[PDB]
């Protein structure tokens, strides 16, 4: 797709039989979700943003489908106000910024 | 141009006659820049993100050049760790996500 930015670039994602939605986020190094369904044990990670720094839960090798495109990579679970797909996964689906 | 996302999408901008660099962020509703002086009257605004809220000064109808592309709109100024161009100005340069 070619997605304009007049609204939030929210897309359908699927992880483990669960349909969610997340924001295609070029300003995020990482993919951060508020919750994942029963994802098991995780690694502690610190990330930062405009307001400060937060503790997140790192899960590696997650099978995720983004707007129909299959990707494998790291998903963080953390107190993000919106579910975000970061560059770690955006590159995997061949996503670019164009103007 | 076409910008891949293997690294942060930082680009050259020009604002208040000064060359700066800023992160093209599809996950930012608004444009937030580091401390600088801008013309006109500002209003107090708060913006959210990862790590909490920050206090910014809102300047309206500001001219910004993003990779030589002219855009007029709202620029927030405050204690951001990185200059961020949000959707409010990305739309003004016809920036799209493509995959």
């Amino acid at each position: 797709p070619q997605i304009t930015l007049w609204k939030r670039p929210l897309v359908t994602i699927k992880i483990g039989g669960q349909l969610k939605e997340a924001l295609l986020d070029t300003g995020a190094d990482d993919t951060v979700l508020e919750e994942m369904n029963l994802p098991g044990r995780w690694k502690p990670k610190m990330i930062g943003g405009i307001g400060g720094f937060i503790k997140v839960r790192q899960y590696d090798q997650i099978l995720i489908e983004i707007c129909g495109h299959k990707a494998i990579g790291t998903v963080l679970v953390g107190p993000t106000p919106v579910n975000i797909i970061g560059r770690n996964l955006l590159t995997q689906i061949g996503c670019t910024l164009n103007f | 141009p076409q910008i891949t996302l293997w690294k942060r999408p930082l680009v050259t901008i020009k604002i208040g006659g000064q060359l700066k660099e800023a992160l093209l962020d599809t996950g930012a509703d608004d444009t937030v820049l580091e401390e600088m002086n801008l013309p006109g009257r500002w209003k107090p605004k708060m913006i959210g993100g990862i790590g909490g809220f920050i206090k910014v000064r809102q300047y309206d109808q500001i001219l910004i050049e993003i990779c030589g592309h002219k855009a007029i709109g709202t620029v927030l100024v405050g204690p951001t760790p990185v200059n961020i161009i949000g959707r409010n100005l990305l739309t003004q340069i016809g920036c799209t996500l493509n995959f």
Partner: peptide
């Protein structure tokens, strides 16, 4: 409004 992650 949010402005998303270092």
């Amino acid at each position: 409004x949010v402005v998303x992650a270092x």
